[PDB]
Amino acid sequence: RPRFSFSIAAREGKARTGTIEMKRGVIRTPAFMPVGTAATVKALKPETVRATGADIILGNTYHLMLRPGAERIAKLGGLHSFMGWDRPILTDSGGYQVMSLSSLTKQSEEGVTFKSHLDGSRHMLSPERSIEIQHLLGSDIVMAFDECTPYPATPSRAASSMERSMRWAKRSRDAFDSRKEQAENAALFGIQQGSVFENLRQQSADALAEIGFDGYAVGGLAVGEGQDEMFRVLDFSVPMLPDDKPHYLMGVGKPDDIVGAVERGIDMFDCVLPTRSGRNGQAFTWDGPINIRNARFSEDLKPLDSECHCAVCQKWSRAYIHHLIRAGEILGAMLMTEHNIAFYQQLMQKIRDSISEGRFSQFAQDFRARYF
Amino acid sequence: RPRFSFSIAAREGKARTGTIEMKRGVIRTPAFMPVGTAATVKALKPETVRATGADIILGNTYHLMLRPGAERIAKLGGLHSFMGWDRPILTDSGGYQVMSLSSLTKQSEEGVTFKSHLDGSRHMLSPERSIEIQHLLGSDIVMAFDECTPYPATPSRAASSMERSMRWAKRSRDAFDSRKEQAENAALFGIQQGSVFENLRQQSADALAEIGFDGYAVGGLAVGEGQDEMFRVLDFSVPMLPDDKPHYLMGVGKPDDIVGAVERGIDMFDCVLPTRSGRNGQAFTWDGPINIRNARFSEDLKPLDSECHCAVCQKWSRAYIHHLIRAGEILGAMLMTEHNIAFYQQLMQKIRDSISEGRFSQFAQDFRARYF
Ligand SMILES: Nc1cc(CSc2ncc[nH]2)c2nc(N)[nH]c(=O)c2c1
Ligand SMILES: Nc1cc(CSc2ncc[nH]2)c2nc(N)[nH]c(=O)c2c1
Ligand SMILES: [Zn+2]
Ligand SMILES: [Zn+2]
């Protein structure tokens, strides 16, 4: 396979279905990427993640640079070898989680200095260092280092962050290109900013296309604006991005949000929602999510979902999983997580099939009627 | 297969190797039984437990009567169906864990009244109720309800508890026999008491043989007496039990203890040691246990054990597992537990092969030289 090749096989309105070919494998789009926090997809062996249908997973750069260390993972042979996942891996830049999870962050034009929420140590993440860490991890899809904008944001603050992010996008591109092995074996995605402002989103898209990237992410959404607002921003933002490259909506996982985002031109998704759902007891079903801990499931012999084809639904009952979760048993988390990730993959498969078959609009309608 | 059939294929000194045939399957002895606390073998799917070579698992009656409930598990179809393990299951009587984990225990000749360490509720466990709960669970090997003796124990207190236990052994036998389905499909094991006193152990064995059971357990050991003392008691106690029936040493799991116990005539074992080892970071190797959390394993690319054939040792490094455990990741517990249980099963296989081949003494010697 080539370093990177995105091909669109079918379309329906703004929706697209196709494939991304990379050295480590093929990624079917629209794609959902399970999240690996500390070099592990919570409570699942990599073989189990693949069994659910996942073609690619996301790796948390912020946690990895802290916990095991980027240089250490490189010395050990890279993230793929370290965790046992040999397919593509998309790594975020670490900038977002720096503002969310770290302490005493000092920002500047060079980058951001911060203290670890673990040992209390200090690090200086910049466009160059972020690109370098992702290289050390052996990432297949590298995310440009940006400055996310807090919601709500004023036009001037949103413009300032967006402009800085574009300057950082150019630095990320140059850093990526100067490293021969990375430029020849991995891909680089640029991230669009501009908050909820159309003119800013347009300026960001133009700057991003001018630099040139393998894919484009719509950043700055799913930050507390609500679905209607998010969809409204997607309506005008996605068409601004190059049509022939992948469109990635960062941090969006709710099933209805995914369906709506695909209808607006999004090709890639990721989310900790499935992995955290099996932490508090939420299991996705075609009839909406259910909290397995509720007393009504104590003697329910039916599987989590009536049509789900995952191993969990083939072998265990709601009653058993209800018991496991309430007992705080590890198997409960393993079972809940596997089902949820499988559910998401089945959702993506149904989306891909309906688009290929010219019946995606009908699918979206049927899905919502039942789910809500 | 028949309800119960123990056959000895080979012997070497006091050591034996053979099989126990039951309706749900064959159990190769000497056997090690992984422990299922709350209807689950900690961090492992039942298919994974079987993959390690386990022929039978132990179910914690005390926890099951509290957490999901005996009557509820029966309404749901039994423990086997509930947790997804279709092979034999040995269930303890619940008497031991009642004295160890419950509050305000009131003992009498009828049984024991106690308060749950969970909700603070109250229950009255007796020989009859214990036998009934194990029936409701659908247990294959039922343990008689006894009164364990605290270490150290005076001759009079040890005699009193032993005598009560024998009266309770008769009540357990009668309760088991009066329930047609249980008597025809399950087996009943009697438990020998008498602390460290030879005459008491002899009186217990005679009373037990007089009543008649499918197997005999040596109870009251591994309660703080030390290996030398435990071995000393086993030296005279095991020969007192019927030769043609299984000998089960309760709550003994250390590898060296298992080897020594087999040399003294023990056929069955169980222990939470493997499951708890992967909780604090202890991994068994043929060169002795290692604490994976230690800094020396941070960049160790070798598997947990150099010759172990488990999937964990085939796919992941010490470095990765070290990271997972220190990060508190669920996958760390899953991986550690699977390896440890596999290690124990490989230990039992090596013991069975060496006995069948008339080289068990040599194996015991070689194992100790390397392990210590
Ligand atoms: N919503 C959102 C989520 C993420 C993290 S990817 C993720 N989120 C949740 C789990 N994983 C984002 N990351 C970056 N770098 N920039 C963004 O604008 C941004 C926006
Ligand atoms: N040592 C020991 C362990 C156990 C529990 S089985 C178990 N122990 C640890 C995990 N599982 C015992 N149980 C009973 N009923 N009677 C005993 O004398 C006794 C002695
Ligand atoms: Zn399922
Ligand atoms: Zn192993």
PDB file of C-alpha atoms in Angstrom, chain B residues 151-271:
ATOM      1  CA  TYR B 151      -4.724 -21.206  64.729  1.00  0.00           C
ATOM      2  CA  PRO B 152      -3.317 -21.734  67.247  1.00  0.00           C
ATOM      3  CA  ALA B 153      -5.883 -23.994  68.936  1.00  0.00           C
ATOM      4  CA  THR B 154      -5.825 -25.863  72.245  1.00  0.00           C
ATOM      5  CA  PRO B 155      -6.508 -29.632  72.179  1.00  0.00           C
ATOM      6  CA  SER B 156      -9.929 -29.191  73.834  1.00  0.00           C
ATOM      7  CA  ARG B 157     -11.095 -26.398  71.518  1.00  0.00           C
ATOM      8  CA  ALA B 158      -9.772 -28.301  68.491  1.00  0.00           C
ATOM      9  CA  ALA B 159     -11.575 -31.457  69.669  1.00  0.00           C
ATOM     10  CA  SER B 160     -14.837 -29.550  70.233  1.00  0.00           C
ATOM     11  CA  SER B 161     -14.809 -27.922  66.777  1.00  0.00           C
ATOM     12  CA  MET B 162     -13.742 -31.166  65.106  1.00  0.00           C
ATOM     13  CA  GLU B 163     -16.564 -33.081  66.818  1.00  0.00           C
ATOM     14  CA  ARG B 164     -19.123 -30.407  65.859  1.00  0.00           C
ATOM     15  CA  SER B 165     -17.805 -30.486  62.278  1.00  0.00           C
ATOM     16  CA  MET B 166     -18.316 -34.252  62.184  1.00  0.00           C
ATOM     17  CA  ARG B 167     -21.899 -33.855  63.420  1.00  0.00           C
ATOM     18  CA  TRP B 168     -22.346 -31.230  60.709  1.00  0.00           C
ATOM     19  CA  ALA B 169     -20.755 -33.591  58.156  1.00  0.00           C
ATOM     20  CA  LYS B 170     -23.507 -36.128  58.891  1.00  0.00           C
ATOM     21  CA  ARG B 171     -26.155 -33.408  58.538  1.00  0.00           C
ATOM     22  CA  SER B 172     -24.593 -32.275  55.230  1.00  0.00           C
ATOM     23  CA  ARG B 173     -24.575 -35.866  53.944  1.00  0.00           C
ATOM     24  CA  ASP B 174     -28.232 -36.392  54.872  1.00  0.00           C
ATOM     25  CA  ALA B 175     -29.323 -33.038  53.393  1.00  0.00           C
ATOM     26  CA  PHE B 176     -27.472 -33.811  50.141  1.00  0.00           C
ATOM     27  CA  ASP B 177     -28.998 -37.321  49.936  1.00  0.00           C
ATOM     28  CA  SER B 178     -32.585 -36.180  50.577  1.00  0.00           C
ATOM     29  CA  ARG B 179     -32.433 -33.955  47.498  1.00  0.00           C
ATOM     30  CA  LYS B 180     -32.761 -36.434  44.622  1.00  0.00           C
ATOM     31  CA  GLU B 181     -31.503 -34.184  41.793  1.00  0.00           C
ATOM     32  CA  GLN B 182     -28.427 -33.200  43.787  1.00  0.00           C
ATOM     33  CA  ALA B 183     -27.614 -36.744  44.944  1.00  0.00           C
ATOM     34  CA  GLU B 184     -27.879 -38.068  41.386  1.00  0.00           C
ATOM     35  CA  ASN B 185     -25.984 -35.300  39.568  1.00  0.00           C
ATOM     36  CA  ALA B 186     -23.449 -33.859  42.026  1.00  0.00           C
ATOM     37  CA  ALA B 187     -20.717 -35.107  44.391  1.00  0.00           C
ATOM     38  CA  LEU B 188     -20.196 -34.387  48.115  1.00  0.00           C
ATOM     39  CA  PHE B 189     -16.810 -33.929  49.815  1.00  0.00           C
ATOM     40  CA  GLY B 190     -16.299 -34.251  53.570  1.00  0.00           C
ATOM     41  CA  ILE B 191     -13.778 -32.050  55.390  1.00  0.00           C
ATOM     42  CA  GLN B 192     -11.243 -33.342  57.923  1.00  0.00           C
ATOM     43  CA  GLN B 193     -10.516 -31.130  60.961  1.00  0.00           C
ATOM     44  CA  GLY B 194      -8.469 -31.609  64.130  1.00  0.00           C
ATOM     45  CA  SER B 195      -5.994 -28.731  63.873  1.00  0.00           C
ATOM     46  CA  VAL B 196      -2.375 -29.993  64.196  1.00  0.00           C
ATOM     47  CA  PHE B 197      -3.287 -32.907  66.494  1.00  0.00           C
ATOM     48  CA  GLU B 198      -2.791 -36.423  65.137  1.00  0.00           C
ATOM     49  CA  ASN B 199      -5.377 -38.200  67.318  1.00  0.00           C
ATOM     50  CA  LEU B 200      -8.020 -35.611  66.407  1.00  0.00           C
ATOM     51  CA  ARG B 201      -7.169 -35.913  62.697  1.00  0.00           C
ATOM     52  CA  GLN B 202      -7.540 -39.684  63.034  1.00  0.00           C
ATOM     53  CA  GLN B 203     -10.921 -39.400  64.770  1.00  0.00           C
ATOM     54  CA  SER B 204     -12.068 -37.001  62.053  1.00  0.00           C
ATOM     55  CA  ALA B 205     -10.929 -39.276  59.215  1.00  0.00           C
ATOM     56  CA  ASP B 206     -12.696 -42.299  60.785  1.00  0.00           C
ATOM     57  CA  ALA B 207     -15.943 -40.354  61.301  1.00  0.00           C
ATOM     58  CA  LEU B 208     -15.740 -39.064  57.710  1.00  0.00           C
ATOM     59  CA  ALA B 209     -15.082 -42.516  56.226  1.00  0.00           C
ATOM     60  CA  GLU B 210     -17.900 -43.939  58.375  1.00  0.00           C
ATOM     61  CA  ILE B 211     -20.392 -41.467  56.871  1.00  0.00           C
ATOM     62  CA  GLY B 212     -18.875 -41.889  53.409  1.00  0.00           C
ATOM     63  CA  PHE B 213     -18.080 -39.145  50.876  1.00  0.00           C
ATOM     64  CA  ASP B 214     -17.001 -38.828  47.228  1.00  0.00           C
ATOM     65  CA  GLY B 215     -13.842 -36.991  48.233  1.00  0.00           C
ATOM     66  CA  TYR B 216     -12.050 -35.787  51.348  1.00  0.00           C
ATOM     67  CA  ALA B 217     -10.608 -32.400  52.114  1.00  0.00           C
ATOM     68  CA  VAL B 218      -7.909 -31.591  54.635  1.00  0.00           C
ATOM     69  CA  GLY B 219      -9.262 -28.464  56.273  1.00  0.00           C
ATOM     70  CA  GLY B 220      -7.788 -26.292  58.991  1.00  0.00           C
ATOM     71  CA  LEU B 221      -4.418 -25.797  57.303  1.00  0.00           C
ATOM     72  CA  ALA B 222      -2.803 -22.768  55.639  1.00  0.00           C
ATOM     73  CA  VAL B 223      -4.151 -20.748  58.589  1.00  0.00           C
ATOM     74  CA  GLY B 224      -0.847 -19.334  59.842  1.00  0.00           C
ATOM     75  CA  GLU B 225       1.038 -22.481  60.888  1.00  0.00           C
ATOM     76  CA  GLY B 226       3.863 -22.264  58.361  1.00  0.00           C
ATOM     77  CA  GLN B 227       4.917 -24.721  55.656  1.00  0.00           C
ATOM     78  CA  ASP B 228       6.997 -27.046  57.868  1.00  0.00           C
ATOM     79  CA  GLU B 229       4.086 -27.480  60.265  1.00  0.00           C
ATOM     80  CA  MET B 230       1.573 -27.821  57.444  1.00  0.00           C
ATOM     81  CA  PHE B 231       3.741 -30.508  55.810  1.00  0.00           C
ATOM     82  CA  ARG B 232       4.148 -32.256  59.165  1.00  0.00           C
ATOM     83  CA  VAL B 233       0.365 -32.422  59.632  1.00  0.00           C
ATOM     84  CA  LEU B 234      -0.072 -33.630  56.031  1.00  0.00           C
ATOM     85  CA  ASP B 235       2.466 -36.412  56.632  1.00  0.00           C
ATOM     86  CA  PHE B 236       0.159 -38.220  59.061  1.00  0.00           C
ATOM     87  CA  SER B 237      -3.235 -36.795  58.013  1.00  0.00           C
ATOM     88  CA  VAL B 238      -3.470 -37.717  54.316  1.00  0.00           C
ATOM     89  CA  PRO B 239      -2.736 -41.461  54.849  1.00  0.00           C
ATOM     90  CA  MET B 240      -5.755 -41.493  57.220  1.00  0.00           C
ATOM     91  CA  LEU B 241      -8.121 -40.636  54.366  1.00  0.00           C
ATOM     92  CA  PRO B 242      -9.527 -43.307  51.992  1.00  0.00           C
ATOM     93  CA  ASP B 243      -6.936 -43.993  49.294  1.00  0.00           C
ATOM     94  CA  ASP B 244      -9.437 -44.502  46.457  1.00  0.00           C
ATOM     95  CA  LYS B 245     -11.020 -41.018  46.741  1.00  0.00           C
ATOM     96  CA  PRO B 246      -9.708 -37.505  45.911  1.00  0.00           C
ATOM     97  CA  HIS B 247      -7.742 -35.590  48.584  1.00  0.00           C
ATOM     98  CA  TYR B 248      -8.322 -31.844  48.510  1.00  0.00           C
ATOM     99  CA  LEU B 249      -6.098 -29.378  50.363  1.00  0.00           C
ATOM    100  CA  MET B 250      -8.173 -26.214  50.844  1.00  0.00           C
ATOM    101  CA  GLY B 251      -6.760 -22.715  50.413  1.00  0.00           C
ATOM    102  CA  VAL B 252      -3.229 -23.753  49.457  1.00  0.00           C
ATOM    103  CA  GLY B 253      -1.691 -22.050  46.450  1.00  0.00           C
ATOM    104  CA  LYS B 254       2.044 -21.272  46.704  1.00  0.00           C
ATOM    105  CA  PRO B 255       3.859 -23.321  43.996  1.00  0.00           C
ATOM    106  CA  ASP B 256       6.260 -24.912  46.473  1.00  0.00           C
ATOM    107  CA  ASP B 257       3.359 -25.780  48.781  1.00  0.00           C
ATOM    108  CA  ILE B 258       1.533 -27.487  45.914  1.00  0.00           C
ATOM    109  CA  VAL B 259       4.589 -29.562  44.984  1.00  0.00           C
ATOM    110  CA  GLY B 260       5.102 -30.569  48.627  1.00  0.00           C
ATOM    111  CA  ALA B 261       1.408 -31.347  49.119  1.00  0.00           C
ATOM    112  CA  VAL B 262       1.307 -33.554  45.996  1.00  0.00           C
ATOM    113  CA  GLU B 263       4.334 -35.448  47.371  1.00  0.00           C
ATOM    114  CA  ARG B 264       2.155 -36.107  50.430  1.00  0.00           C
ATOM    115  CA  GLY B 265      -0.906 -37.385  48.600  1.00  0.00           C
ATOM    116  CA  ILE B 266      -2.971 -34.294  47.712  1.00  0.00           C
ATOM    117  CA  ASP B 267      -4.968 -34.371  44.457  1.00  0.00           C
ATOM    118  CA  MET B 268      -6.751 -30.995  44.386  1.00  0.00           C
ATOM    119  CA  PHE B 269      -5.915 -27.363  45.082  1.00  0.00           C
ATOM    120  CA  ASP B 270      -7.432 -23.889  44.804  1.00  0.00           C
ATOM    121  CA  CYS B 271      -6.183 -20.381  45.554  1.00  0.00           C
TER     122      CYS B 271
END
